[PDB]
TrEMBL record:
Pfam families noted in UniProt: DUF3860-like
High-level lineage: Bacteria, Pseudomonadati, Pseudomonadota, Alphaproteobacteria, Hyphomicrobiales
Protein name as it appears in the record: TenA/THI-4 family protein
Entry superkingdom: Bacteria
């Protein structure tokens, strides 16, 4: 369901340490969409920046090349 551009995004999560916090707005949409896909998981949902963490799918998506 995700595009190659999303693969670039999900791999970035790993390059940032495994967690990726995004403030919000349209930028956060693909992140939560990956949550819907099961690649990301939003645990600490703060009004500052929502913290997304990699799942096993998100890890497999990073290994996907």
């Amino acid at each position: 369901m995700a595009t190659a551009d999303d693969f670039k995004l999900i791999r970035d999560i790993h390059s940032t340490g495994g967690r990726r916090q995004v403030f919000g707005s349209r930028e956060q949409k693909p992140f939560e969409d990956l949550v819907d896909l099961g690649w990301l998981k939003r645990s600490s949902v703060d009004s500052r920046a929502t913290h997304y963490q990699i799942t096993e799918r998100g890890t497999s998506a990073a290994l996907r090349s």
